[PDB]
Design a protein around this ligand. Sequence first.
Ligand SMILES: OC[C@H]1O[C@@](CO)(OC[C@@]2(OC[C@@]3(OC[C@@]4(O[C@H]5O[C@H](CO)[C@@H](O)[C@H](O)[C@H]5O)O[C@H](CO)[C@@H](O)[C@@H]4O)O[C@H](CO)[C@@H](O)[C@@H]3O)O[C@H](CO)[C@@H](O)[C@@H]2O)[C@@H](O)[C@@H]1O
Ligand SMILES: OC[C@H]1O[C@@](CO)(OC[C@@]2(OC[C@@]3(OC[C@@]4(O[C@H]5O[C@H](CO)[C@@H](O)[C@H](O)[C@H]5O)O[C@H](CO)[C@@H](O)[C@@H]4O)O[C@H](CO)[C@@H](O)[C@@H]3O)O[C@H](CO)[C@@H](O)[C@@H]2O)[C@@H](O)[C@@H]1O
Ligand SMILES: OC[C@H]1O[C@@](CO)(OC[C@@]2(OC[C@@]3(OC[C@@]4(O[C@H]5O[C@H](CO)[C@@H](O)[C@H](O)[C@H]5O)O[C@H](CO)[C@@H](O)[C@@H]4O)O[C@H](CO)[C@@H](O)[C@@H]3O)O[C@H](CO)[C@@H](O)[C@@H]2O)[C@@H](O)[C@@H]1O
Ligand SMILES: OC[C@H]1O[C@@](CO)(OC[C@@]2(OC[C@@]3(OC[C@@]4(O[C@H]5O[C@H](CO)[C@@H](O)[C@H](O)[C@H]5O)O[C@H](CO)[C@@H](O)[C@@H]4O)O[C@H](CO)[C@@H](O)[C@@H]3O)O[C@H](CO)[C@@H](O)[C@@H]2O)[C@@H](O)[C@@H]1O
Ligand SMILES: OC[C@H]1O[C@@](CO)(OC[C@@]2(OC[C@@]3(OC[C@@]4(O[C@H]5O[C@H](CO)[C@@H](O)[C@H](O)[C@H]5O)O[C@H](CO)[C@@H](O)[C@@H]4O)O[C@H](CO)[C@@H](O)[C@@H]3O)O[C@H](CO)[C@@H](O)[C@@H]2O)[C@@H](O)[C@@H]1O
Ligand SMILES: OC[C@H]1O[C@@](CO)(OC[C@@]2(OC[C@@]3(OC[C@@]4(O[C@H]5O[C@H](CO)[C@@H](O)[C@H](O)[C@H]5O)O[C@H](CO)[C@@H](O)[C@@H]4O)O[C@H](CO)[C@@H](O)[C@@H]3O)O[C@H](CO)[C@@H](O)[C@@H]2O)[C@@H](O)[C@@H]1O
Ligand SMILES: OC[C@H]1O[C@@](CO)(OC[C@@]2(OC[C@@]3(O[C@H]4O[C@H](CO)[C@@H](O)[C@H](O)[C@H]4O)O[C@H](CO)[C@@H](O)[C@@H]3O)O[C@H](CO)[C@@H](O)[C@@H]2O)[C@@H](O)[C@@H]1O
Lengths: 403, 403, 403
Amino acid sequence: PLNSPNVYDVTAWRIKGQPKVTAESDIGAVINDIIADIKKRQSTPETRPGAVVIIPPGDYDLHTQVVVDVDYLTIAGFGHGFFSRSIKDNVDTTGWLNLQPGGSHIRVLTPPTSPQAFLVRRDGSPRLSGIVFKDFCLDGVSFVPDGNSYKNGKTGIDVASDNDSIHITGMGFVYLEHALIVRGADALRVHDNMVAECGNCVELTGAGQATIVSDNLMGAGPEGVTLLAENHEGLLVTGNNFFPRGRSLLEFTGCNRCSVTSNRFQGFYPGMMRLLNGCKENLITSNHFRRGTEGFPPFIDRTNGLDDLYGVIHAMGDNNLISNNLFAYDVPPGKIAPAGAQPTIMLIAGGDGNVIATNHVISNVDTQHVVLDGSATRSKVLDSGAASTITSYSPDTAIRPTP
Amino acid sequence: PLNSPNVYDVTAWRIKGQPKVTAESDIGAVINDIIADIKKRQSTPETRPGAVVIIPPGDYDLHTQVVVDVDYLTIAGFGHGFFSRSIKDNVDTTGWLNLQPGGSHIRVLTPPTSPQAFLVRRDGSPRLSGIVFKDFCLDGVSFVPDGNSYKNGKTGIDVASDNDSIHITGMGFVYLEHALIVRGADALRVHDNMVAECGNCVELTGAGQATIVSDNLMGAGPEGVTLLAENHEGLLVTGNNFFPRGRSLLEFTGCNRCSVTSNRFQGFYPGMMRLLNGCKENLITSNHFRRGTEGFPPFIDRTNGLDDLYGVIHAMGDNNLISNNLFAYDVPPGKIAPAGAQPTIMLIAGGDGNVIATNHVISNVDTQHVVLDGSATRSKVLDSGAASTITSYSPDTAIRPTP
Amino acid sequence: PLNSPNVYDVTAWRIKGQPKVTAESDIGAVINDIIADIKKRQSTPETRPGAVVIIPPGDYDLHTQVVVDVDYLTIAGFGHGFFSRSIKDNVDTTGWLNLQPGGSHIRVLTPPTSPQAFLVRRDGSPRLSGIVFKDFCLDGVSFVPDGNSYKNGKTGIDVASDNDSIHITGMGFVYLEHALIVRGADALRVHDNMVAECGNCVELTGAGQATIVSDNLMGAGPEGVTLLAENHEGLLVTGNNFFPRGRSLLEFTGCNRCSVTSNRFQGFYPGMMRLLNGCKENLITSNHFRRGTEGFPPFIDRTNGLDDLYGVIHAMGDNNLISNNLFAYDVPPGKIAPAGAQPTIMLIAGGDGNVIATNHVISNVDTQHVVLDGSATRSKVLDSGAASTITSYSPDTAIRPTP
Ligand SMILES: OC[C@H]1O[C@@](CO)(OC[C@@]2(OC[C@@]3(OC[C@@]4(O[C@H]5O[C@H](CO)[C@@H](O)[C@H](O)[C@H]5O)O[C@H](CO)[C@@H](O)[C@@H]4O)O[C@H](CO)[C@@H](O)[C@@H]3O)O[C@H](CO)[C@@H](O)[C@@H]2O)[C@@H](O)[C@@H]1O
Ligand SMILES: OC[C@H]1O[C@@](CO)(OC[C@@]2(OC[C@@]3(OC[C@@]4(O[C@H]5O[C@H](CO)[C@@H](O)[C@H](O)[C@H]5O)O[C@H](CO)[C@@H](O)[C@@H]4O)O[C@H](CO)[C@@H](O)[C@@H]3O)O[C@H](CO)[C@@H](O)[C@@H]2O)[C@@H](O)[C@@H]1O
Ligand SMILES: OC[C@H]1O[C@@](CO)(OC[C@@]2(OC[C@@]3(OC[C@@]4(O[C@H]5O[C@H](CO)[C@@H](O)[C@H](O)[C@H]5O)O[C@H](CO)[C@@H](O)[C@@H]4O)O[C@H](CO)[C@@H](O)[C@@H]3O)O[C@H](CO)[C@@H](O)[C@@H]2O)[C@@H](O)[C@@H]1O
Ligand SMILES: OC[C@H]1O[C@@](CO)(OC[C@@]2(OC[C@@]3(OC[C@@]4(O[C@H]5O[C@H](CO)[C@@H](O)[C@H](O)[C@H]5O)O[C@H](CO)[C@@H](O)[C@@H]4O)O[C@H](CO)[C@@H](O)[C@@H]3O)O[C@H](CO)[C@@H](O)[C@@H]2O)[C@@H](O)[C@@H]1O
Ligand SMILES: OC[C@H]1O[C@@](CO)(OC[C@@]2(OC[C@@]3(OC[C@@]4(O[C@H]5O[C@H](CO)[C@@H](O)[C@H](O)[C@H]5O)O[C@H](CO)[C@@H](O)[C@@H]4O)O[C@H](CO)[C@@H](O)[C@@H]3O)O[C@H](CO)[C@@H](O)[C@@H]2O)[C@@H](O)[C@@H]1O
Ligand SMILES: OC[C@H]1O[C@@](CO)(OC[C@@]2(OC[C@@]3(OC[C@@]4(O[C@H]5O[C@H](CO)[C@@H](O)[C@H](O)[C@H]5O)O[C@H](CO)[C@@H](O)[C@@H]4O)O[C@H](CO)[C@@H](O)[C@@H]3O)O[C@H](CO)[C@@H](O)[C@@H]2O)[C@@H](O)[C@@H]1O
Ligand SMILES: OC[C@H]1O[C@@](CO)(OC[C@@]2(OC[C@@]3(O[C@H]4O[C@H](CO)[C@@H](O)[C@H](O)[C@H]4O)O[C@H](CO)[C@@H](O)[C@@H]3O)O[C@H](CO)[C@@H](O)[C@@H]2O)[C@@H](O)[C@@H]1O
């Protein structure tokens, strides 16, 4: 294709001894054989620049899990190929000109014994570095036992060992229980992807540093996360459009000194944003939050099991700045839990020194813009509603009502 | 080029029955023939993954409108090829080493009755999904009757059918009356494009959902729009650099629960930002606004017909938050209209519950930072200027002057 | 590879009469020969659409400086190939599977008399236009006399003449004294790059207009700048993750009407953000600032020579809005300079009309959240700390303490 042995076309690669295996029959087997060829040629720590695996547009079955254990592997297609399998699965499709996702289309047909399509893992040293996934489609094909479960035990990309400077861009993920998992992410960029109709979209697990999640379209399922970060420092979440129907849109546990700025959040359940287990010194600013109710009939009675006192934002931690956000709450009074409750927009569930400043709230019913738990200390609430919209169970909250 | 029938090189493709037609002579005919080949091979609703059309760098004439009616079509070049035809058309080009745009360079030479270079449209179902335009140049070549009219009736890309997950990235648009139009956009991304010296840059028409317009350079002409959205819900506009000389830089009509955050706006006329016809619950925050005067001699006496009482931001609708913006106004007193008037920076033209908070204004003349129309109800103006810079003709506006 | 003479593969291109000069031995010489071939074929101002130079993954030595003097040259690899040479140089690498960066990997081995790998420069008109550098790695290989000096006199990309619509995206820069310098930038985009372990990351010198620096990961060295801009107008800095250890993370000199919004800033020294020499009318909003101390043993005793009274933000100029930011200051008393001093978070060193509004500061010791020099005029401090945390030596500062 190019005059370099480090450029692979999955549609041109023949597996020695298995002449019937094609990218169409098992792209997993073809890419593992390509990686074996890389490891054969690149055999010292000063001769391992990696390679690019090109996936032309087409339909490819993946039966065999790909183990990515080399630095600077690029897996690159020519399109994210996103298609709403959720709408297809729930309407009359008579006369429809297309019935599945496309582009550089990998159908994830992994067994339960190796359920991640791409397992990015190296035992040993150093951190896996500079791996790129871009411009292709990972499709779990079906949920179990029906299209509305958001369950199938399949993962698109699982990075399971400490990693540096990974770049996930221009991807499409659809109908995976877990689209993308990255554990121990250092200097990760999840940028300009379509991650929708997955049980869970992006899970940043274990710990992380200096990460950017930007310019993504994401929608998850009601038992799953849209974006989750665990023990991240300096994660920046910006320019994302998060839409239903994750249990949450943004969930941090033990994340400190992170920034969630300039995003759009639309959810159908309480607890769209959760800062859990002592999140400290986070900036939650310049975001648009819309709490609505489900319009799509197959999900109308589906819930994340939380009531409207949980908060649109539910925060437990110290010295977070929740500022300069707009909250638009519109839930029919008969869909509010418990019956006759004032919904909570921002709940300070616990912690010291949290500051809520310049937030504009619109609701169709009487709401508490801010509730602060009895355990909250040295809280500040400025210009985020009339006195009558701010509930401090804590005796020491300083409150400036909107004039 | 690759071992897939779904990868096309426009410079290698021969049209059966028209053997002398090349990408150089009519790339539109070549791409139409390629799309016919895709539809011949991809002949069932479960065998349509689409294809990539590759445009090497070069000068290509497009005479025949391309009709894109297949899902997951990627059209990709290797460069946006942007060149200022505006400077070229208006100065002495003696000894100039280049006189036109380049990269993957499509000269748009469409007939007046089929003027859009790319018409993206399908009659039937489902929505066209996952189409990608990237990394090429669409050039309208000339404006008529002269280079400064911003008129030629040509469009770069016109999406005229309901669409899902379209991605427009790394493009160059120049000297088109309309660069990009997208009707009924759902989960659209207009990302990291150069759209400049077009009459109109980006028109998001009809209605839309869950769209991101991010990281673009845009500049339009005095009778057209830079970014227009009509009846959008959850549109996120972030990281854009909007420069002159559109009639407006951002124009929303009937848009609700949208966000315009972390952009740079430079305009030479009033009405740089317009929220029109009852826009509700939009966040307008963390933007830099610069109102100046035309410095390029060919356009010095051009106007958009609006006076300085119209506003840098003109807002008509309910419950918008306009916060944490900087406005730098510098217009020679002789060019301010009406004669001797104080320019208006933010005009609330009408609507209920709008909040203006924490805005810094600089002006070379005495200005009203905020004017509220008499018809505005339950408005708040916080820390957006001294009492002498806020005019509320509405009697129920709550004003906290900057201390 | 494709049926166009404007598509070059550096691994396929042979220099006629120099068969020993390959991409591997001197990719500089190869690309210079490709540019001579472009110039020979594209011989008139109406036949210069430019070309693409494709860099497959591999290890390539660059001994000869590349002179880019043609419009619409795209130089494109398949991977940024980033690897921490800094960690590699300072820890036990026994059993390490990789010891250097990779991807589309250019080892910069330039002579001291032509030290920039890529010099983008043209004498004559018009401005160089539409040049693209994407998806490859520029590696300076070593700092001298040891890995921790940040010194080698090498530059990755130096744009030395006036330019329009340049695009730098998906790049990796490592172990260069200067990664990227762009003089006289007009409509430049530095987007989604990895620029780390360089003495200086991005220097926007001379003057500039309408530029975007977005979605980058950047880390410099203690004598150098992360992002520098000189006399820029309408620069937008957004979505970036700036980490240590530059002298500063953002340094503006004489920049006016620019915007720094929705970024993450982590530094180990005072003066993380500097608005120097009369910066006017800039927006600094919705940013996360973290001032910490060096944790990586090899750099523990390194400093940028400034004391803790300099400021996390140091501003000298008029009418800047510094609002809606979070500052997390944690420096052990034994590392504060001078010993026993009260650190300053935001210093207004001078100028007229600066506004500081809605800033949340956390500090491990008592700090002055805001200090205004005696020379400051018409300053506003709103909701950026209790009265005991704001010090105005200027008599005309209006202060509203946080309630
Ligand atoms: O909530 C987001 C979440 O839901 C998913 C599906 O599980 O996305 C659903 C989506 O639309 C829901 C909505 O419409 C469904 C509908 O169709 C669409 O197709 C139309 C025809 O061209 C488009 O014009 C329209 O814009 C599309 O939304 O399906 C039926 C026909 O197939 C129509 O009756 C519907 O219009 O359902 C309610 C019904 O009132 C509407 O408000 C929605 O448009 O959700 C968003 C909008 O809420 C949209 O992007 C999706 O299509 C999943 O992808 C997400 O995770
Ligand atoms: O003094 C700063 C100094 O200490 C270091 C670590 O030695 O960092 C601590 C840190 O937090 C200080 C902070 O919280 C302390 C602590 O508080 C929890 O318990 C309180 C019960 O009294 C609750 O009120 C509070 O909500 C809980 O978070 O938090 C730690 C758990 O992470 C526990 O070790 C403590 O018990 O002190 C006050 C409360 O007293 C809070 O406002 C702070 O969060 O200091 C910085 C803030 O300056 C913060 O990042 C750290 O976690 C060291 O690095 C510092 O130099
Ligand atoms: O307002 C943006 C809008 O206008 C367009 C043109 O229709 O962009 C023009 C632009 O600059 C206007 C400005 O400069 C014009 C001038 O400078 C250009 O050319 C020089 C040499 O080729 C370059 O060195 C310089 O950087 C260019 O800007 O062009 C003429 C001929 O070269 C010179 O006489 C000018 O100096 O006009 C005045 C000076 O007359 C300056 O204040 C301007 O810079 O607008 C922006 C800056 O305002 C800049 O990026 C553009 O070049 C169009 O592209 C936009 O939609
Ligand atoms: O009570 C909420 C409940 O109603 C639903 C629709 O059944 O949504 C309405 C909505 O808006 C409420 C809001 O505006 C009402 C209305 O106002 C227009 O007319 C007024 C009188 O001339 C003007 O003062 C105002 O500026 C106009 O916008 O808007 C409707 C059309 O969109 C008209 O039919 C109404 O007359 O009520 C007050 C004004 O009384 C405004 O602040 C509101 O915008 O409710 C939500 C906000 O809570 C908003 O998104 C909706 O448009 C239903 O969905 C809700 O549960
Ligand atoms: O309406 C604001 C608008 O007016 C201008 C003048 O057209 O500013 C008026 C304003 O400032 C006056 C002031 O400006 C300093 C000046 O130079 C600074 O910047 C240079 C780099 O760009 C440095 O080399 C120099 O050392 C700096 O002092 O700023 C301009 C360029 O930005 C230069 O033209 C100026 O020389 O002049 C005095 C010095 O005499 C300074 O203290 C001021 O900063 O006037 C009021 C104060 O009365 C102030 O609020 C305004 O900024 C224009 O620059 C503005 O955009
Ligand atoms: O400050 C940024 C600046 O420093 C550079 C190096 O010059 O980046 C360093 C970095 O980490 C510093 C840190 O840990 C380094 C350390 O750990 C890494 O490796 C571990 C697995 O081997 C990972 O689990 C961990 O996440 C990595 O940070 O490297 C050594 C070898 O592994 C270990 O001894 C270290 O623990 O140093 C202190 C402790 O010494 C920790 O607090 C830090 O994580 O900083 C960035 C994050 O901004 C991270 O990616 C780097 O590894 C340079 O690249 C930057 O300009
Ligand atoms: O499933 C809902 C039932 O569970 C309870 C707990 O037995 O509600 C849990 C719930 O709301 C609790 C709530 O109240 C607590 O704190 C108050 C102030 O400190 C105190 O007076 C209450 O006695 C105590 O229960 O939390 C907030 C205050 O933080 C308040 O608004 C709530 O009433 O926990 C979630 C919040 O974290 C809510 O979604 C949920 O309702 C019982 O009350 C429910 O019937």
